Symmetry: D4
Subunit: 133 residues, 8 copies
């Protein structure tokens, strides 16, 4: 059911989605998705820093769709990605599977690449201190 408050989701490239969910006033079992995305995928720019994500989550059947514009104070890749997929909380690990699309330019030549990402839940590690453990 619920992963409410802040949740930490890590995909196959090291990439981190942190989701925040706020109930929608008009749309039943629908949450506004907010939070941050850290890109760590080897080929790409806009890696290692917080990009706000926006989208919508349908609780009923644990579906989601969210977007990142690859522009923040550290780096701009002049492009946008949208992720659309589903959750599966069953068992010892919780998994999100998504199909993604990415709008960009090569010349004055606009283009939409595409692909697929798989995120797994990982709960905050705890350390004695910043310095140790």
């Amino acid at each position: 059911k619920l992963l409410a408050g802040a949740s930490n989701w890590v995909n196959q490239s090291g990439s981190v989605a942190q989701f925040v969910f706020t109930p929608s006033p008009t749309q039943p079992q629908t949450y506004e998705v907010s939070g941050n995305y850290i890109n760590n995928a080897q080929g790409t720019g806009c890696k290692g820093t917080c990009y706000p994500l926006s989208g919508a989550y349908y609780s009923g059947n644990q579906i989601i769709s969210f977007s990142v514009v690859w522009s923040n104070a550290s780096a701009n890749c002049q492009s946008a990605t949208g992720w659309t997929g589903y959750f599966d909380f069953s068992g010892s690990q919780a998994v999100l599977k998504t199909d993604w699309n990415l709008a960009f330019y090569s010349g004055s030549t606009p283009a939409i690449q595409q692909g697929q990402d798989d995120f797994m839940q990982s709960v905050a590690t705890v350390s004695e201190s910043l310095l140790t453990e």
Copy 2:
């Protein structure tokens, strides 16, 4: 360039995107996308009523990604569409070329169909009154 205020975008199958753009407080040349989608395609669920849309827009090269959860007070199709794309405002007509992904079900069998919607800007039709024209 500029769509400040609400703008009306109509796809090949007649479905309607109404966009509102709000500046991101932190993301250079990025706007939070809100507004409403009215799905008007022949063989489809959840048609002829407003679905909220949420996403993001990059004004640098006029790229967008938005999402709709198909649940409102009229009809629940327990599914999500994500659209990712770009706009060309050159010439007599402004067009939004999009690709899109749609996370839905059959049984216990999650799915994700792909597609392409192309939209054209259409400025409010004006009438003497609600009864004329």
Copy 3:
């Protein structure tokens, strides 16, 4: 009694009122009315898209008055409807009996037609998906 969350109300001519109720901070048993109206009557302007509605509701005896300005990103009929009425939730069906007034034009000749819409509550139709049903 209670319509907490968004509710769907359909009139004789098929037009759709989606209501949201927020408690007044100061008015006993009064709610601020928001939501969306989709005008679906044969011989009319400004049909098949969401118009915002604003008004007020008295929960003591389940009375309402709301208004729509027929101007959105799709179509401007330069006019306003006001609806004033009451609800009966008794029995198998919940109905909203309304009278209404509509301020529009011809030439330089302001006008105000009268009328009566009657609405019935219809709870979200459910589908396996956006493609089925």
Copy 4:
């Protein structure tokens, strides 16, 4: 055109509408109406005290529609009125003309009376002090 900020409007029964106008984010040349209404009509209850009003104003052709639920901390008349009409700023005086409807109960017997009100603009009188002039 503009009566922006707070405006004072007095009808034939002494009744006072104070309007506040805030531009709508989605609806072009449309304002959310807020403010207060003081009833001073001889036959009625809920006289002499502030009732919040809600509605919508279409600037284009200076049209309006607004609602009052006759419930506040001083008095409850368990009913609601909606006013729908037009402005005429021409000449030495500014005038609003409206058609109104009023939903109420007699027995378990719901009912909608009706009528018409005409409001004129009156700018704040100025006095040397509260005590004099």
Copy 5:
């Protein structure tokens, strides 16, 4: 103890205070006072219409102090009053007693009159309708 939500308070001149109380974040057993004041005192201007009041209420020993600037969309008396006094909820009636001060000008000649007002609680009268009872 509590008169929370909206409360209706009537003094010896017919004058009406409606109070709204919101807990203070920093000041224990302290409420921000807001609401409306209707002046109906015979000698004065700024009579019969809503003036916002501002002040602070100390719950502990049911003490209060609030202010009205006699300027609104209907009338300006270019002056300000402050009321400071205490509650007594005991018995069949609830009473507020206050000492008031009023800052105004005669010539270029500034001046502070003074006086005392006594308010009694009066709960919303209820009527069959606006029209009757």
Copy 6:
């Protein structure tokens, strides 16, 4: 005339009023008064720490009324001061002439002492650092 931003006002007994002014949304030439009061009088409770102040100001003739509830995280004197007055910004010095009322206790014996504070504007003293001067 103008005190936009925070201003510092010092009375004869050394107590400090720090004022912030916010335009009323509805009251011509009226500002909501916020800020902080530090009571510095010899023979008094609740001294040397910030008490919130709330009131209203009329910029037409530079008149004010504000209130302090003497309860904060340091000291509770279970009492309220109301100040009512006017400002003279003519000459080399800006002065705020005030009268005031103070609702406090003895036993089961509510009281309300009267008074007069006169304040002078004093613009931030500047230092090389927190350690110098």
Copy 7:
């Protein structure tokens, strides 16, 4: 454990920290710190008036870091203090052990002195009135 509402903390030199804690929307067991600091040390600038404080608090082991910019409507020392530390609520007394850094000037010669303040919680002193005690 818990300091919900405003709390009063007094250091060895008599300076006063008034704390307010608000839950972070995203940071487990983290609170945004607001409130006011009154600097009461002998040989110092910017004393006896409220400086806003801002920082963060970790309730897991009751650790804090807050900052004051020494500029308000009374006195500008063009400098910043940062405090970093921990609380012990065991026993008859609650103490906040802190170290701190202070970024100030001489000429064109930026500096940063180090230090240690230790605070003790002191619950509001109560008085019959502002005049007694």
Copy 8:
């Protein structure tokens, strides 16, 4: 002077501060600091993800102080750091120098380490796309 909107600041360990500045209502030439901090310092935990920072910036002499509680959805190090230091925009590069303190526990044994960080401004790199340049 100004680095207003979102700014990107990189220290000697790879660590990234993104600052957002909002003018303070009460404190002249003072900004509330907000934004995000990415830790990339070799010895430590809580590395590679967004931690909200809070503090205050004094424009006058370009001074700053801000805090991070090392707790977010990815990782908790149960500790807090405060940074206090100054800017120097002169020349071809803009530099921030800071003294930092860090509160943590070893056993039931609380402790405050300390150190110094130097951040340099780095403006958003621009890339043809996420995929290339």
